mmCIF file with all atom_site columns, C-alpha atoms in Angstrom:
data_model
loop_
_atom_site.group_PDB
_atom_site.id
_atom_site.type_symbol
_atom_site.label_atom_id
_atom_site.label_alt_id
_atom_site.label_comp_id
_atom_site.label_asym_id
_atom_site.label_entity_id
_atom_site.label_seq_id
_atom_site.pdbx_PDB_ins_code
_atom_site.Cartn_x
_atom_site.Cartn_y
_atom_site.Cartn_z
_atom_site.occupancy
_atom_site.B_iso_or_equiv
_atom_site.pdbx_formal_charge
_atom_site.auth_seq_id
_atom_site.auth_comp_id
_atom_site.auth_asym_id
_atom_site.auth_atom_id
_atom_site.pdbx_PDB_model_num
ATOM 1   C CA . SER A 1 1   ? 10.141  -25.893 2.225   1.00 34.99 ? 1   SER A CA 1
ATOM 2   C CA . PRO A 1 2   ? 8.974   -22.535 -0.154  1.00 36.47 ? 2   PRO A CA 1
ATOM 3   C CA . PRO A 1 3   ? 8.375   -19.405 1.334   1.00 34.80 ? 3   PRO A CA 1
ATOM 4   C CA . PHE A 1 4   ? 4.349   -18.994 1.999   1.00 36.94 ? 4   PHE A CA 1
ATOM 5   C CA . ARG A 1 5   ? 2.739   -15.733 2.791   1.00 37.61 ? 5   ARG A CA 1
ATOM 6   C CA . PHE A 1 6   ? 0.642   -14.732 5.163   1.00 37.23 ? 6   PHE A CA 1
ATOM 7   C CA . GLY A 1 7   ? -0.240  -10.898 4.131   1.00 38.34 ? 7   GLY A CA 1
ATOM 8   C CA . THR A 1 8   ? -1.990  -9.534  6.259   1.00 38.68 ? 8   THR A CA 1
ATOM 9   C CA . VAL A 1 9   ? -2.419  -4.990  6.537   1.00 39.35 ? 9   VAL A CA 1
ATOM 10  C CA . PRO A 1 10  ? -2.108  -4.024  9.802   1.00 42.13 ? 10  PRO A CA 1
ATOM 11  C CA . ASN A 1 11  ? -5.632  -2.445  11.516  1.00 40.30 ? 11  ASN A CA 1
ATOM 12  C CA . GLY A 1 12  ? -7.833  -4.773  10.191  1.00 38.98 ? 12  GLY A CA 1
ATOM 13  C CA . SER A 1 13  ? -10.014 -7.439  11.466  1.00 43.00 ? 13  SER A CA 1
ATOM 14  C CA . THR A 1 14  ? -7.906  -10.347 9.625   1.00 45.23 ? 14  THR A CA 1
ATOM 15  C CA . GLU A 1 15  ? -4.828  -9.613  11.721  1.00 45.94 ? 15  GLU A CA 1
ATOM 16  C CA . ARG A 1 16  ? -7.100  -9.605  15.003  1.00 45.14 ? 16  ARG A CA 1
ATOM 17  C CA . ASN A 1 17  ? -8.608  -12.409 14.467  1.00 46.70 ? 17  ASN A CA 1
ATOM 18  C CA . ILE A 1 18  ? -5.501  -14.521 13.806  1.00 48.94 ? 18  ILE A CA 1
ATOM 19  C CA . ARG A 1 19  ? -3.811  -13.227 16.801  1.00 46.35 ? 19  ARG A CA 1
ATOM 20  C CA . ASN A 1 20  ? -6.648  -14.085 18.629  1.00 43.84 ? 20  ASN A CA 1
ATOM 21  C CA . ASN A 1 21  ? -7.460  -17.662 17.357  1.00 42.46 ? 21  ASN A CA 1
ATOM 22  C CA . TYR A 1 22  ? -4.425  -19.293 16.146  1.00 41.03 ? 22  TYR A CA 1
ATOM 23  C CA . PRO A 1 23  ? -1.367  -16.603 17.352  1.00 46.10 ? 23  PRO A CA 1
ATOM 24  C CA . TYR A 1 24  ? 1.120   -18.689 15.600  1.00 49.09 ? 24  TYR A CA 1
ATOM 25  C CA . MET A 1 25  ? 1.775   -17.908 11.938  1.00 48.32 ? 25  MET A CA 1
ATOM 26  C CA . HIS A 1 26  ? 1.491   -14.301 12.878  1.00 48.84 ? 26  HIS A CA 1
ATOM 27  C CA . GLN A 1 27  ? 5.135   -14.137 14.237  1.00 47.75 ? 27  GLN A CA 1
ATOM 28  C CA . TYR A 1 28  ? 6.291   -16.030 10.920  1.00 45.62 ? 28  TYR A CA 1
ATOM 29  C CA . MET A 1 29  ? 4.716   -13.668 8.733   1.00 47.03 ? 29  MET A CA 1
ATOM 30  C CA . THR A 1 30  ? 5.174   -10.583 10.888  1.00 46.80 ? 30  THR A CA 1
ATOM 31  C CA . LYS A 1 31  ? 7.386   -8.586  8.643   1.00 45.75 ? 31  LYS A CA 1
ATOM 32  C CA . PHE A 1 32  ? 5.175   -9.377  5.612   1.00 47.16 ? 32  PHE A CA 1
ATOM 33  C CA . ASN A 1 33  ? 2.231   -7.420  5.429   1.00 42.80 ? 33  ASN A CA 1
ATOM 34  C CA . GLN A 1 34  ? 2.037   -5.274  2.126   1.00 43.51 ? 34  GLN A CA 1
ATOM 35  C CA . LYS A 1 35  ? 1.248   -1.408  2.608   1.00 41.71 ? 35  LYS A CA 1
ATOM 36  C CA . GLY A 1 36  ? -2.280  -1.483  1.100   1.00 40.70 ? 36  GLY A CA 1
ATOM 37  C CA . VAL A 1 37  ? -4.300  -3.762  -1.709  1.00 38.64 ? 37  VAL A CA 1
ATOM 38  C CA . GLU A 1 38  ? -3.277  -2.411  -4.373  1.00 42.57 ? 38  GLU A CA 1
ATOM 39  C CA . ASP A 1 39  ? 0.437   -2.793  -4.018  1.00 42.19 ? 39  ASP A CA 1
ATOM 40  C CA . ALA A 1 40  ? -0.850  -6.478  -2.514  1.00 44.21 ? 40  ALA A CA 1
ATOM 41  C CA . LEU A 1 41  ? -2.557  -7.458  -5.534  1.00 40.25 ? 41  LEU A CA 1
ATOM 42  C CA . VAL A 1 42  ? 0.972   -6.392  -7.249  1.00 38.28 ? 42  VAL A CA 1
ATOM 43  C CA . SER A 1 43  ? 2.741   -8.406  -5.246  1.00 38.42 ? 43  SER A CA 1
ATOM 44  C CA . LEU A 1 44  ? 0.406   -11.489 -5.716  1.00 40.18 ? 44  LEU A CA 1
ATOM 45  C CA . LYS A 1 45  ? 1.144   -11.195 -9.449  1.00 39.84 ? 45  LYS A CA 1
ATOM 46  C CA . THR A 1 46  ? 4.209   -10.426 -9.486  1.00 40.80 ? 46  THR A CA 1
ATOM 47  C CA . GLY A 1 47  ? 5.492   -14.293 -8.181  1.00 39.04 ? 47  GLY A CA 1
ATOM 48  C CA . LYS A 1 48  ? 7.242   -14.154 -4.815  1.00 41.76 ? 48  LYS A CA 1
ATOM 49  C CA . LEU A 1 49  ? 4.390   -15.521 -2.875  1.00 41.19 ? 49  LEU A CA 1
ATOM 50  C CA . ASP A 1 50  ? 1.041   -16.619 -3.705  1.00 41.75 ? 50  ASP A CA 1
ATOM 51  C CA . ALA A 1 51  ? -1.073  -16.064 -0.970  1.00 38.94 ? 51  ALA A CA 1
ATOM 52  C CA . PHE A 1 52  ? -3.690  -13.780 0.763   1.00 39.84 ? 52  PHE A CA 1
ATOM 53  C CA . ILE A 1 53  ? -5.624  -13.818 3.925   1.00 42.00 ? 53  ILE A CA 1
ATOM 54  C CA . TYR A 1 54  ? -7.923  -11.296 3.392   1.00 40.88 ? 54  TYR A CA 1
ATOM 55  C CA . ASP A 1 55  ? -12.056 -10.737 3.769   1.00 40.03 ? 55  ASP A CA 1
ATOM 56  C CA . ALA A 1 56  ? -14.017 -13.256 1.775   1.00 45.62 ? 56  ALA A CA 1
ATOM 57  C CA . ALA A 1 57  ? -16.447 -10.333 0.359   1.00 44.28 ? 57  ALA A CA 1
ATOM 58  C CA . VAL A 1 58  ? -13.594 -7.952  -0.868  1.00 42.03 ? 58  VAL A CA 1
ATOM 59  C CA . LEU A 1 59  ? -11.592 -11.489 -2.397  1.00 44.28 ? 59  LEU A CA 1
ATOM 60  C CA . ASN A 1 60  ? -14.870 -12.234 -3.814  1.00 46.44 ? 60  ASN A CA 1
ATOM 61  C CA . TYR A 1 61  ? -15.246 -9.264  -5.573  1.00 48.07 ? 61  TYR A CA 1
ATOM 62  C CA . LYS A 1 62  ? -11.707 -9.014  -6.729  1.00 48.55 ? 62  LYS A CA 1
ATOM 63  C CA . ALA A 1 63  ? -12.142 -12.499 -8.429  1.00 51.35 ? 63  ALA A CA 1
ATOM 64  C CA . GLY A 1 64  ? -15.237 -12.246 -9.887  1.00 50.54 ? 64  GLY A CA 1
ATOM 65  C CA . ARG A 1 65  ? -14.193 -8.609  -11.211 1.00 55.32 ? 65  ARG A CA 1
ATOM 66  C CA . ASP A 1 66  ? -10.377 -9.593  -12.187 1.00 54.53 ? 66  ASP A CA 1
ATOM 67  C CA . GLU A 1 67  ? -8.689  -8.863  -15.562 1.00 54.50 ? 67  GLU A CA 1
ATOM 68  C CA . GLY A 1 68  ? -9.404  -12.114 -17.371 1.00 52.87 ? 68  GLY A CA 1
ATOM 69  C CA . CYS A 1 69  ? -9.994  -13.993 -13.368 1.00 51.88 ? 69  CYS A CA 1
ATOM 70  C CA . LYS A 1 70  ? -6.942  -14.961 -12.994 1.00 53.56 ? 70  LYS A CA 1
ATOM 71  C CA . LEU A 1 71  ? -6.177  -15.483 -9.180  1.00 53.24 ? 71  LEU A CA 1
ATOM 72  C CA . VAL A 1 72  ? -8.236  -17.055 -7.424  1.00 52.94 ? 72  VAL A CA 1
ATOM 73  C CA . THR A 1 73  ? -9.602  -18.344 -4.048  1.00 52.95 ? 73  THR A CA 1
ATOM 74  C CA . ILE A 1 74  ? -8.747  -21.440 -2.177  1.00 55.39 ? 74  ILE A CA 1
ATOM 75  C CA . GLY A 1 75  ? -12.173 -23.544 -1.321  1.00 54.79 ? 75  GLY A CA 1
ATOM 76  C CA . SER A 1 76  ? -15.799 -22.303 -2.044  1.00 54.07 ? 76  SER A CA 1
ATOM 77  C CA . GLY A 1 77  ? -15.443 -19.536 0.176   1.00 55.84 ? 77  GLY A CA 1
ATOM 78  C CA . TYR A 1 78  ? -14.850 -21.385 3.336   1.00 57.07 ? 78  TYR A CA 1
ATOM 79  C CA . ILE A 1 79  ? -14.847 -18.603 5.475   1.00 56.32 ? 79  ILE A CA 1
ATOM 80  C CA . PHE A 1 80  ? -12.884 -19.225 8.699   1.00 56.66 ? 80  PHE A CA 1
ATOM 81  C CA . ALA A 1 81  ? -15.656 -17.373 10.611  1.00 57.99 ? 81  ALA A CA 1
ATOM 82  C CA . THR A 1 82  ? -18.652 -15.598 9.533   1.00 58.09 ? 82  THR A CA 1
ATOM 83  C CA . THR A 1 83  ? -19.293 -12.483 10.809  1.00 61.73 ? 83  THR A CA 1
ATOM 84  C CA . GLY A 1 84  ? -20.445 -10.223 8.190   1.00 60.55 ? 84  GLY A CA 1
ATOM 85  C CA . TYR A 1 85  ? -20.496 -6.390  9.020   1.00 62.07 ? 85  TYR A CA 1
ATOM 86  C CA . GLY A 1 86  ? -21.915 -4.005  10.920  1.00 59.52 ? 86  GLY A CA 1
ATOM 87  C CA . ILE A 1 87  ? -23.606 -0.310  11.628  1.00 59.90 ? 87  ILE A CA 1
ATOM 88  C CA . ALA A 1 88  ? -21.979 2.047   14.004  1.00 60.02 ? 88  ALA A CA 1
ATOM 89  C CA . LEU A 1 89  ? -24.156 3.763   16.222  1.00 58.38 ? 89  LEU A CA 1
ATOM 90  C CA . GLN A 1 90  ? -23.251 5.820   19.463  1.00 55.33 ? 90  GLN A CA 1
ATOM 91  C CA . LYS A 1 91  ? -23.470 4.091   22.964  1.00 56.35 ? 91  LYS A CA 1
ATOM 92  C CA . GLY A 1 92  ? -27.718 4.563   23.910  1.00 54.45 ? 92  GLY A CA 1
ATOM 93  C CA . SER A 1 93  ? -28.241 6.219   20.699  1.00 52.11 ? 93  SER A CA 1
ATOM 94  C CA . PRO A 1 94  ? -32.123 6.560   20.595  1.00 55.28 ? 94  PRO A CA 1
ATOM 95  C CA . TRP A 1 95  ? -32.283 4.880   17.150  1.00 56.14 ? 95  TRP A CA 1
ATOM 96  C CA . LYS A 1 96  ? -31.322 1.644   17.279  1.00 55.53 ? 96  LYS A CA 1
ATOM 97  C CA . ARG A 1 97  ? -34.320 -0.565  17.262  1.00 54.96 ? 97  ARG A CA 1
ATOM 98  C CA . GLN A 1 98  ? -35.751 1.585   14.568  1.00 52.36 ? 98  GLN A CA 1
ATOM 99  C CA . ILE A 1 99  ? -32.325 1.178   12.361  1.00 53.08 ? 99  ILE A CA 1
ATOM 100 C CA . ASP A 1 100 ? -32.927 -2.769  13.289  1.00 53.88 ? 100 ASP A CA 1
ATOM 101 C CA . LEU A 1 101 ? -36.168 -2.590  11.822  1.00 53.26 ? 101 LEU A CA 1
ATOM 102 C CA . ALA A 1 102 ? -35.700 -0.856  8.569   1.00 51.33 ? 102 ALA A CA 1
ATOM 103 C CA . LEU A 1 103 ? -33.022 -2.919  7.983   1.00 52.81 ? 103 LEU A CA 1
ATOM 104 C CA . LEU A 1 104 ? -34.924 -6.122  8.367   1.00 52.16 ? 104 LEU A CA 1
ATOM 105 C CA . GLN A 1 105 ? -37.810 -4.322  6.133   1.00 50.66 ? 105 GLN A CA 1
ATOM 106 C CA . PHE A 1 106 ? -35.116 -4.290  3.302   1.00 50.03 ? 106 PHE A CA 1
ATOM 107 C CA . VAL A 1 107 ? -33.980 -7.345  3.834   1.00 51.71 ? 107 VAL A CA 1
ATOM 108 C CA . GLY A 1 108 ? -36.962 -8.247  3.170   1.00 51.17 ? 108 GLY A CA 1
ATOM 109 C CA . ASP A 1 109 ? -38.373 -6.313  0.222   1.00 53.38 ? 109 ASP A CA 1
ATOM 110 C CA . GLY A 1 110 ? -35.969 -7.957  -2.275  1.00 55.33 ? 110 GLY A CA 1
ATOM 111 C CA . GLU A 1 111 ? -33.938 -4.852  -2.552  1.00 56.40 ? 111 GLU A CA 1
ATOM 112 C CA . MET A 1 112 ? -30.166 -5.228  -0.895  1.00 57.92 ? 112 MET A CA 1
ATOM 113 C CA . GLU A 1 113 ? -30.117 -8.125  -3.971  1.00 59.40 ? 113 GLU A CA 1
ATOM 114 C CA . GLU A 1 114 ? -30.385 -5.448  -6.606  1.00 61.09 ? 114 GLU A CA 1
ATOM 115 C CA . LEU A 1 115 ? -27.753 -3.714  -5.002  1.00 60.09 ? 115 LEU A CA 1
ATOM 116 C CA . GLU A 1 116 ? -25.686 -6.579  -4.658  1.00 56.82 ? 116 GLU A CA 1
ATOM 117 C CA . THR A 1 117 ? -26.179 -7.084  -8.834  1.00 58.55 ? 117 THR A CA 1
ATOM 118 C CA . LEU A 1 118 ? -25.627 -3.490  -8.960  1.00 56.15 ? 118 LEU A CA 1
ATOM 119 C CA . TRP A 1 119 ? -22.050 -3.473  -7.549  1.00 54.30 ? 119 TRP A CA 1
ATOM 120 C CA . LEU A 1 120 ? -20.696 -5.940  -6.101  1.00 56.63 ? 120 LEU A CA 1
ATOM 121 C CA . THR A 1 121 ? -21.590 -8.535  -9.172  1.00 58.12 ? 121 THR A CA 1
ATOM 122 C CA . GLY A 1 122 ? -18.719 -9.657  -11.005 1.00 59.74 ? 122 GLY A CA 1
ATOM 123 C CA . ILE A 1 123 ? -18.233 -10.607 -15.017 1.00 60.52 ? 123 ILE A CA 1
ATOM 124 C CA . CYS A 1 124 ? -16.854 -14.430 -14.306 1.00 61.13 ? 124 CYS A CA 1
ATOM 125 C CA . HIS A 1 125 ? -19.581 -15.449 -11.350 1.00 59.45 ? 125 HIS A CA 1
ATOM 126 C CA . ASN A 1 126 ? -21.642 -17.315 -13.597 1.00 59.95 ? 126 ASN A CA 1
ATOM 127 C CA . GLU A 1 127 ? -18.642 -18.258 -15.836 1.00 58.26 ? 127 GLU A CA 1
ATOM 128 C CA . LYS A 1 128 ? -17.176 -21.650 -15.056 1.00 57.87 ? 128 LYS A CA 1
ATOM 129 C CA . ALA B 2 1   ? -33.015 -36.380 -1.024  1.00 55.42 ? 1   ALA B CA 1
ATOM 130 C CA . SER B 2 2   ? -29.790 -37.590 0.521   1.00 53.47 ? 2   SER B CA 1
ATOM 131 C CA . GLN B 2 3   ? -31.295 -40.754 1.896   1.00 50.38 ? 3   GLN B CA 1
ATOM 132 C CA . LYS B 2 4   ? -33.579 -41.584 -0.391  1.00 50.84 ? 4   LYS B CA 1
ATOM 133 C CA . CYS B 2 5   ? -32.468 -40.230 -3.532  1.00 50.90 ? 5   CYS B CA 1
ATOM 134 C CA . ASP B 2 6   ? -35.380 -40.385 -5.663  1.00 47.14 ? 6   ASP B CA 1
ATOM 135 C CA . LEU B 2 7   ? -35.979 -36.411 -6.032  1.00 51.99 ? 7   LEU B CA 1
ATOM 136 C CA . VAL B 2 8   ? -33.897 -33.807 -6.852  1.00 52.20 ? 8   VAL B CA 1
ATOM 137 C CA . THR B 2 9   ? -32.581 -30.326 -5.895  1.00 52.44 ? 9   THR B CA 1
ATOM 138 C CA . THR B 2 10  ? -33.903 -28.010 -8.124  1.00 58.79 ? 10  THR B CA 1
ATOM 139 C CA . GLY B 2 11  ? -34.231 -24.240 -7.757  1.00 60.38 ? 11  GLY B CA 1
ATOM 140 C CA . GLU B 2 12  ? -31.943 -21.829 -6.096  1.00 62.90 ? 12  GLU B CA 1
ATOM 141 C CA . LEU B 2 13  ? -31.658 -20.565 -2.349  1.00 61.83 ? 13  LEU B CA 1
ATOM 142 C CA . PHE B 2 14  ? -32.889 -16.807 -1.057  1.00 64.53 ? 14  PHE B CA 1
ATOM 143 C CA . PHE B 2 15  ? -35.199 -15.560 1.750   1.00 65.10 ? 15  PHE B CA 1
ATOM 144 C CA . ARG B 2 16  ? -32.069 -17.060 3.837   1.00 62.88 ? 16  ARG B CA 1
ATOM 145 C CA . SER B 2 17  ? -33.069 -16.722 7.640   1.00 61.03 ? 17  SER B CA 1
ATOM 146 C CA . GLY B 2 18  ? -31.000 -17.595 10.289  1.00 61.58 ? 18  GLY B CA 1
ATOM 147 C CA . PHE B 2 19  ? -32.561 -20.058 12.326  1.00 57.87 ? 19  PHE B CA 1
ATOM 148 C CA . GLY B 2 20  ? -33.213 -18.560 15.735  1.00 59.91 ? 20  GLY B CA 1
ATOM 149 C CA . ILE B 2 21  ? -34.006 -19.085 19.251  1.00 59.49 ? 21  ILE B CA 1
ATOM 150 C CA . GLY B 2 22  ? -36.938 -16.224 20.263  1.00 56.79 ? 22  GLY B CA 1
ATOM 151 C CA . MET B 2 23  ? -38.112 -15.923 23.862  1.00 53.68 ? 23  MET B CA 1
ATOM 152 C CA . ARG B 2 24  ? -40.702 -13.622 25.487  1.00 55.55 ? 24  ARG B CA 1
ATOM 153 C CA . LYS B 2 25  ? -39.564 -9.894  26.252  1.00 54.20 ? 25  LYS B CA 1
ATOM 154 C CA . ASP B 2 26  ? -38.587 -11.074 30.045  1.00 53.13 ? 26  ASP B CA 1
ATOM 155 C CA . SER B 2 27  ? -36.279 -14.335 30.284  1.00 51.19 ? 27  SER B CA 1
ATOM 156 C CA . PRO B 2 28  ? -33.133 -14.268 32.619  1.00 51.28 ? 28  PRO B CA 1
ATOM 157 C CA . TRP B 2 29  ? -31.291 -16.807 29.812  1.00 56.64 ? 29  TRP B CA 1
ATOM 158 C CA . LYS B 2 30  ? -31.799 -14.681 26.562  1.00 58.40 ? 30  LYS B CA 1
ATOM 159 C CA . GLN B 2 31  ? -27.896 -13.198 27.166  1.00 58.49 ? 31  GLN B CA 1
ATOM 160 C CA . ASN B 2 32  ? -27.052 -16.824 28.904  1.00 52.72 ? 32  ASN B CA 1
ATOM 161 C CA . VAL B 2 33  ? -28.027 -19.202 26.124  1.00 51.52 ? 33  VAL B CA 1
ATOM 162 C CA . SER B 2 34  ? -26.922 -16.205 23.357  1.00 51.34 ? 34  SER B CA 1
ATOM 163 C CA . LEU B 2 35  ? -23.299 -16.341 24.983  1.00 47.37 ? 35  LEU B CA 1
ATOM 164 C CA . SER B 2 36  ? -23.049 -20.083 25.586  1.00 47.39 ? 36  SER B CA 1
ATOM 165 C CA . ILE B 2 37  ? -24.490 -20.671 21.655  1.00 46.01 ? 37  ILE B CA 1
ATOM 166 C CA . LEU B 2 38  ? -21.721 -18.083 20.583  1.00 46.75 ? 38  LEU B CA 1
ATOM 167 C CA . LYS B 2 39  ? -18.734 -20.358 22.549  1.00 45.47 ? 39  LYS B CA 1
ATOM 168 C CA . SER B 2 40  ? -20.296 -23.216 21.186  1.00 45.50 ? 40  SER B CA 1
ATOM 169 C CA . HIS B 2 41  ? -20.486 -22.349 17.360  1.00 42.53 ? 41  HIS B CA 1
ATOM 170 C CA . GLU B 2 42  ? -16.752 -20.904 18.074  1.00 41.74 ? 42  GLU B CA 1
ATOM 171 C CA . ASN B 2 43  ? -15.593 -24.258 19.549  1.00 39.56 ? 43  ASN B CA 1
ATOM 172 C CA . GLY B 2 44  ? -17.287 -26.091 16.360  1.00 35.02 ? 44  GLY B CA 1
ATOM 173 C CA . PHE B 2 45  ? -19.310 -28.654 19.004  1.00 33.97 ? 45  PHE B CA 1
ATOM 174 C CA . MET B 2 46  ? -22.298 -27.943 16.674  1.00 32.01 ? 46  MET B CA 1
ATOM 175 C CA . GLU B 2 47  ? -20.107 -29.152 13.913  1.00 30.78 ? 47  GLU B CA 1
ATOM 176 C CA . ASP B 2 48  ? -19.798 -32.402 15.337  1.00 30.01 ? 48  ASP B CA 1
ATOM 177 C CA . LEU B 2 49  ? -23.029 -33.257 15.533  1.00 28.83 ? 49  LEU B CA 1
ATOM 178 C CA . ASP B 2 50  ? -23.844 -32.007 12.293  1.00 28.11 ? 50  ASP B CA 1
ATOM 179 C CA . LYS B 2 51  ? -21.365 -34.884 11.140  1.00 25.15 ? 51  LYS B CA 1
ATOM 180 C CA . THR B 2 52  ? -22.632 -37.723 13.803  1.00 26.00 ? 52  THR B CA 1
ATOM 181 C CA . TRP B 2 53  ? -26.334 -37.290 13.072  1.00 25.33 ? 53  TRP B CA 1
ATOM 182 C CA . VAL B 2 54  ? -27.621 -35.978 9.581   1.00 29.51 ? 54  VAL B CA 1
ATOM 183 C CA . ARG B 2 55  ? -24.705 -35.369 7.089   1.00 29.46 ? 55  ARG B CA 1
ATOM 184 C CA . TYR B 2 56  ? -23.728 -39.427 7.404   1.00 30.02 ? 56  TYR B CA 1
ATOM 185 C CA . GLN B 2 57  ? -25.134 -40.797 3.840   1.00 31.44 ? 57  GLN B CA 1
ATOM 186 C CA . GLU B 2 58  ? -25.384 -40.579 0.335   1.00 31.63 ? 58  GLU B CA 1
ATOM 187 C CA . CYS B 2 59  ? -26.236 -42.798 -2.850  1.00 31.39 ? 59  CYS B CA 1
#
């Protein structure tokens, strides 16, 4: 009954994943994509429809570092498909194995946790 | 701790290592097993096994 939202900005992972997996709700909200993410947050606050299917990491950071942590996310981070991020390289570049070795080594040496705690750590993450 | 709920689950999670399946440097099934397990994960076949084998009891 009520007009809900499926706001997904073009040229992104969310729209492509939705249309690859469940190409049914995209047509319903084809003419609903917001211009960017700041105007998307503005439209989320300015009540016309309270729904955004976005990246788990970006949404979690925004919720953690929000003004009073008002808007939230449905579920305990139940990602539709946890695929993560990747690092680009040229086709057949001579550095891929070394890149992977360095990445796994830095995964081992407890430092990306420091990076996350320095940059993406929220204020209400501990708060309930 | 779910079946014989006598202990607790203190502590947090760290050093999160996704369980893999390693092979020798030569094997004609590495790509095939990789794509098969990716397809199973995408269609959620493993979730049904989790429901029917492990996550089935509480106290």
